[PDB]
Amino acid sequence: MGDTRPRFLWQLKFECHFFNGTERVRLLERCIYNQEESVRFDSDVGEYRAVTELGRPDAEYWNSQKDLLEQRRAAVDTYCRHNYGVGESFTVQRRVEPKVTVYPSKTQPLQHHNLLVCSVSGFYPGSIEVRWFRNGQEEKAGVVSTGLIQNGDWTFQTLVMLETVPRSGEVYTCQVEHPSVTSPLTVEWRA
Amino acid sequence: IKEEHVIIQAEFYLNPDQSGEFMFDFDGDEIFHVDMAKKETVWRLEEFGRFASFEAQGALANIAVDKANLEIMTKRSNYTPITNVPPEVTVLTNSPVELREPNVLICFIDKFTPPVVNVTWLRNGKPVTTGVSETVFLPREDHLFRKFHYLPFLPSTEDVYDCRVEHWGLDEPLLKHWEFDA
């Protein structure tokens, strides 16, 4: 990008970790210089700790401020639990149903090898179960999955492909289970 | 990780570009960020802004403090610069492609730093800027960044597309290609 001048980066991250809804909460405040974490505050520790030498002046300076320390100790309640509650309805409780299609990867003739694609797109959250069936028998052996793909727009997609040698009269079925639907989605492809 | 969720308030300042960022992340997805030029809260999806609000002035004041901290830490490290880490680039569609039915190309940019990148969409080698949208730099546990760019398009057998990414860690601009396969 033309500009060869040196760059200097400072990052500040407040991580709120939640377990069992809000039954257990941990706050991790991290300062990162360039690509190295320098100093952190771990709510399980209760005070700032230096990760590298560069961060030692800050930790000690911050640990001498009792107001800052008490505020950070209470931030699991005033900061973490509050923001969880604020966004609960459209984050934790977000449910978007997947769209499932089945199609052959290539128009390769019959009695020859083919990749059948089960496309599962537009869903949230990430947990999902995709299974292939030949004439009602579960196929676990030739299943090639792209894994979970984050689209960046609060939807996921995944491509689960089955290696097959399709013969006439065979029926292939892709079954998808996801929290947004109570009963599975099933799409079939006829050979 | 089944019962666990993570909310991250991630912000940064970069010199000498004088670039700042402030955003909230939930399980890896952006809830909102603050546009510094417009001084405004930008929700990642519109519906979010109908359940929640945010006072953006706090974000701006945070960024000012981050700037002062960035200059102090730079001096304290004997002016140690960051080492460029070049990005990985992937191009996908967001749904199965059907000829002449609207779709979206996704350009996923991952595992890079510093958070400065130049992205261009090319259709048949020509820059395309119509309907495009993009995310800010998203945080990663390894303290690198992610980014998404989007291009709505009408699939056809006649067009090829490239996502061109420039970054100081690359020897040359990187082009990732997409085509319909008949």
């Binding site: 407040f14 002046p57 900061y79 | 308030q9 359940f51 945070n62």
Partner: peptide, 15 residues
């Protein structure tokens, strides 16, 4: 509407 609470950025040591 409920508001997100800000994590206040603090000043580092030195000058």
């Amino acid at each position: 509407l409920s508001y997100y609470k800000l994590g206040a950025s603090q000043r580092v040591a030195g000058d």
